[PDB]
């Protein structure tokens, strides 16, 4: 119940920050005294809910030799009027007494909402009590104030101003590497069986917080007990120890627990996440591959030539082309190359968060990408922004609405020195306003054509990298016959053909064929159907000839 550094894992970069911010001024205040700067007393934690934010507090606090105080959000708000503000004054006097001091406040937004958006003056006093007492502190006190929340936007920003809270520290969703470590934290207390592959689990878990993983560990434990319920009689007052020794959680319990009612985590926000697709997994289009190698990889790798040449680059890249051409995966593979952070934003994600009005988060998309620089910001489905008013034809309203007017501010509100990059992608590029296509905003426009038969060969090579295909498969004879078919169409054929294979596989299981026959294919090849009209392409090829007329 007392937390060390080993009890938390995965968010190493974040803990590297806090040790510089909290561990460093306390065990060595002389360093800031020798260099002659002020120690930051404004450490702020934030992130998604249930992400160890309370856990990382004591992970730092118990690893000091400093007196660590504590203050819960709802505990003060539970108190009566006046007495609640007394405890804050009782808090800081003890911390300024025991001068090496840590003040952590969990759920800071409950005692500090926006003063504009609040009703009770008792809430307004305790905010005003907090704003007063933060400034009443001293640098000679050597007392560090920590605060955590899950809603960094609901806070009164006067705290987030200078002198009170300056150190915005986000706790992001961990990678499969770091969440593997988190599983090892919870399972090292657990009693498992030898079949348990956490690395298989951590690969199969993608958007979970540690609370989801701890519930995941707690879930597969229960199913292990459910298997033993036949051997366990509940009318007994104590079960025997032999079933306790056999109580070892299987890998299949996690396979049960993987599809449990715990999987559904909190991934309905604006997330930053490193991608997984690469250049080999996208067949063909090597010209615009190199164009991204020109336009976005050269700044993130070498800003030195720019200051050599005195020229800031174009930060605005627009993808366009026919639909179903893998334009979503393109920005993921290039962020996976130069290891930049990645933020996927779709069209209705703007709108559905604006039926709930999350537009500071839209600014925070740029801010977190500024916080996670180098980062690329990917705007999927830009036609949906036009389809917020139906289209450019639409309900007579064009692409421009409150979304565009927000984005044009935030795209122009980006420093050109920043390597934070914005990637736009649509399939209906005529149906977007040129105000967003304005130079400085989005001036690079990249057409994504259909592949040729060599590209369609390279896709079918790349798509079937994980499939047990047959040996007689002439993909080139497929690539000969597939001409007008998109890369989405080719994957759609394989989804048909695998379904045709399962119409042989479990059909045989009802009457292992791990091979995808020509008979599986020539049925789907006869059933093959083109999704893109060539007269639609003749539009896009005229745009590929010339869209700069606009």
């Amino acid at each position: 119940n007392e937390v060390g550094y080993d009890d938390i894992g995965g968010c190493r970069k974040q803990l590297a920050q806090i040790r510089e911010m909290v561990e460093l001024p306390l065990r060595h205040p002389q360093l800031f005294k020798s260099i002659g700067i002020k120690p930051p007393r404004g450490v702020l934690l934030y992130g998604p809910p249930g992400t160890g934010k309370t856990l990382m507090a004591r992970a730092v606090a118990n690893e000091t030799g400093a007196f660590f105080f504590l203050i819960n959000g709802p505990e003060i708000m539970s108190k009566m009027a006046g007495e609640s503000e007394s405890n804050l004054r009782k808090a800081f006097e003890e911390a300024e007494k025991n001068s090496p001091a840590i003040i952590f406040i969990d759920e800071i937004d409950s005692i500090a909402p926006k003063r504009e958006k609040t009703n009770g003056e008792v809430e307004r006093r305790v905010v005003s009590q907090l704003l007063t007492l933060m400034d009443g502190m001293k640098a000679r006190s050597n007392v560090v104030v920590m605060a955590a929340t899950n809603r960094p936007n609901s806070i009164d920003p006067a705290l987030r101003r200078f002198g009170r809270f300056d150190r915005e520290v986000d706790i992001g969703i961990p990678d499969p590497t770091g969440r593997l470590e988190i599983l090892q934290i919870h399972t090292k207390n657990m009693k498992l069986a030898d079949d348990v592959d956490l690395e298989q689990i951590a690969a199969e878990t993608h958007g979970y917080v540690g609370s989801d993983l701890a519930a995941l560990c707690s879930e597969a434990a229960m199913q292990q007990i459910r298997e033993k319920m036949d051997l366990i009689d509940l009318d007994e007052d104590t079960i025997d120890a032999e079933v306790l020794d056999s109580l070892g959680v299987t890998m299949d319990n996690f396979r049960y627990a993987l599809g449990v009612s715990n999987p559904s985590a909190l991934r309905e926000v604006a997330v930053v996440e490193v991608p997984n697709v690469r250049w080999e997994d996208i067949g063909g289009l090597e010209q615009v591959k190199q164009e991204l190698k020109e336009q976005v990889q050269y700044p993130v790798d070498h800003p030195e030539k720019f200051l050599k040449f005195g020229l800031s680059p174009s930060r605005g890249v627009l993808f366009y082309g026919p639909p179903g051409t893998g334009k979503t995966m393109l920005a993921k593979a290039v962020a996976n190359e130069c290891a930049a952070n990645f933020i996927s934003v779709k069209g209705p994600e703007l709108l559905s968060m604006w039926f709930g009005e999350s537009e500071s988060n839209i600014r925070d998309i740029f801010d977190k990408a500024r916080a996670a620089a180098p980062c690329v910001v990917f705007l999927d489905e830009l036609d949906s922004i036009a389809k917020a008013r139906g289209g450019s034809i639409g309900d007579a309203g064009g692409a421009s609405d409150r979304v565009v007017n927000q984005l044009l501010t935030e795209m122009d509100g980006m420093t050109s020195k920043k390597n934070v990059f914005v990637i736009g992608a649509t399939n209906r590029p005529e149906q977007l306003d040129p105000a967003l296509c304005r130079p400085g905003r989005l001036d690079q426009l990249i057409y994504v054509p259909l592949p040729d038969e060599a590209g369609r060969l390279s896709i079918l090579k790349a798509q079937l990298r994980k499939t047990p295909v047959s040996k007689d498969v002439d993909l080139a004879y497929i690539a000969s016959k597939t001409h007008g078919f998109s890369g989405a169409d080719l994957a759609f054929i394989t989804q048909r053909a695998v379904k045709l294979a399962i119409k042989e596989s479990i059909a045989a299981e009802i009457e292992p064929v791990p091979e995808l026959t020509k008979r599986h294919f020539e049925e789907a090849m006869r059933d093959a159907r083109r999704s893109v009209s060539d007269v639609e392409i003749r539009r896009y090829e005229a745009f590929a000839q010339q869209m700069k007329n606009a």
């Binding site: 007196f67 007394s86 405890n87 009782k90 003890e94 007494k97």
Partner: protein
């Protein structure tokens, strides 16, 4: 270094009172939806601070411990040691000294970070002591002999100890054993003191006897002129209860006697020191009204704020070094509303005291059983302190006769004689309070008490 509540030490009573919750256990109440080992909303154990419980038991305020266990969680408890918050706050209505905002001291400099707050004189929701057990009527009947012979008033000092008073929950009782009186110039409606001279001496007797200065008593006994002991009904609803000069003067002495506490920010909270006024009832019999100043009323004397008026019910607010902000008092009008009236320039004195009950044991067994000494500072009635009484008091020329020292007035006179040394007088006040036979036989075989024999076998 440590906290005060990490270095201060409670009384043994406060050690006794901490280990109890004081919870009042109900059995199965009305709306039980359970078997007999279940619970509902109406068969929980009760609180020491429970107002409906205090209302049905007619108890005015909760005890300070019942106040202590109300305002604080159970986890916040000094057996944590370091991580403890003292829930009690001794009031600080003086002036934020050593102000951390660049401006001078209070004097020459002021800002918002150094000013104290304006006072809301609510009634104090608690009190220190609940019952005032006078251990014998003969303690009083000795004490009121000055008034029956003269008719002028009388002040004293409550001595004794604080024990559990089990009639009210977590009740502390001021068990009263003894009274000493300093030199004083006595008048009728007021009393002015001479300075007290043997201040370490009589306190040493209490240190010997296991007593201490537990409070103050005085009298408001004005005989109504019919010869029975009836009073002018002057301390009641329509007139007043406390004279405001008495309030300030007791709070002078109450600031001279705070109580150390492991639950307060300074390591001390409140005061063991209490207050009693001997008076008469409506029925014409000698009654007693016991009180104590509030922790604001101590502080406003410590921070030099309030002042008596000609009206005893009105308390003046002092006009303008110091800092006198608003004072209020919450009212209850004829429809229950709470109206903080402006207390400048005057306000009722009701919001400054706490009420206490008072009485006797079922049968008197105090630490003192003897009454043989003429009381000090009464040479104006010819009642003096001379050595010649000990030939009849301790019966030393009648050298067979046993030990009559069970008399604090005489024990201070023996301490005024100062013959027995610090261990032998604590062997005297051992036998003067416990009366052990083999230790009287030890003391009648000690040298210094036989010195106290052989000196007083040769006086007249």
């Amino acid at each position: 270094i440590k906290n005060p509540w990490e270095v201060v030490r409670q009384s043994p009573l406060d050690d006794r009172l901490d280990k109890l919750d004081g919870k009042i256990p109900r059995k199965r109440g009305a709306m039980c939806r359970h078997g007999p080992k279940g619970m509902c909303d109406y068969c929980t154990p009760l609180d020491p601070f429970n107002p409906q419980y205090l209302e049905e038991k007619k108890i005015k305020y909760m005890s300070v411990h019942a106040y202590m266990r109300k305002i604080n969680s159970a986890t916040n408890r000094p057996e944590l040691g370091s991580s403890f918050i003292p829930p009690l706050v001794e009031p600080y209505y003086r002036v934020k000294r050593d102000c951390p905002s660049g401006h001078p001291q209070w004097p020459e400099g002021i800002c918002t970070k150094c000013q104290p707050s304006a006072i809301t004189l609510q009634p104090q929701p608690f009190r220190m002591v609940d019952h005032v057990e006078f251990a014998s009527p003969q303690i009083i009947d000795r004490f009121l002999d000055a008034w029956r012979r003269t008719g002028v008033q009388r002040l004293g000092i409550l001595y004794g100890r604080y024990l559990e008073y089990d009639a009210v929950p977590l009740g502390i009782k001021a068990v009263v054993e003894a009274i000493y009186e300093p030199p004083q110039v006595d008048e009728i409606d007021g009393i002015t003191l001479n300075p007290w001279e043997n201040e370490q001496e009589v306190n040493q007797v209490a240190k010997y006897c296991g007593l201490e200065q537990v409070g103050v008593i005085w009298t408001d006994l004005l005989d109504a002129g019919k010869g029975d002991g009836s009073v002018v009904c002057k301390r009641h609803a329509d007139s007043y209860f406390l004279a405001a000069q008495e309030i300030v003067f007791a709070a002078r002495l109450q600031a001279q006697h705070p109580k150390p506490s492991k639950w307060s920010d300074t390591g001390r909270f409140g005061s063991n020191f209490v207050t009693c006024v001997v008076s008469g009832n409506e029925q014409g019999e000698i009654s007693i009204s016991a009180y104590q100043m509030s922790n604001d009323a101590v502080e406003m004397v410590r921070a030099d704020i309030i002042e008596p008026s000609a009206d005893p019910t009105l308390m003046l607010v002092r006009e303008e070094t110091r800092y006198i902000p608003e004072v209020f008092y919450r009212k209850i009008n004829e429809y229950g509303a709470n109206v903080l009236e402006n207390a400048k320039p005057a306000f009722p004195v009701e919001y400054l005291f706490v009420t206490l009950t008072h009485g006797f044991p079922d049968s008197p067994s105090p630490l003192f059983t003897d009454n043989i000494f003429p009381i000090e500072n009464r040479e104006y009635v010819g009642e003096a302190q001379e050595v010649s009484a000990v030939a009849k008091a301790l019966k030393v020329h009648e050298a067979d006769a046993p030990m009559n020292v069970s008399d604090f007035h005489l024990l201070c006179f023996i301490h005024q004689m100062s013959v027995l040394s610090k261990e032998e007088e604590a062997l005297l006040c051992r036998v003067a309070t416990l009366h052990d036979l083999a230790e009287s036989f030890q003391l009648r075989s000690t040298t210094g008490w036989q010195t106290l024999h052989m000196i007083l076998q040769s006086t007249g």
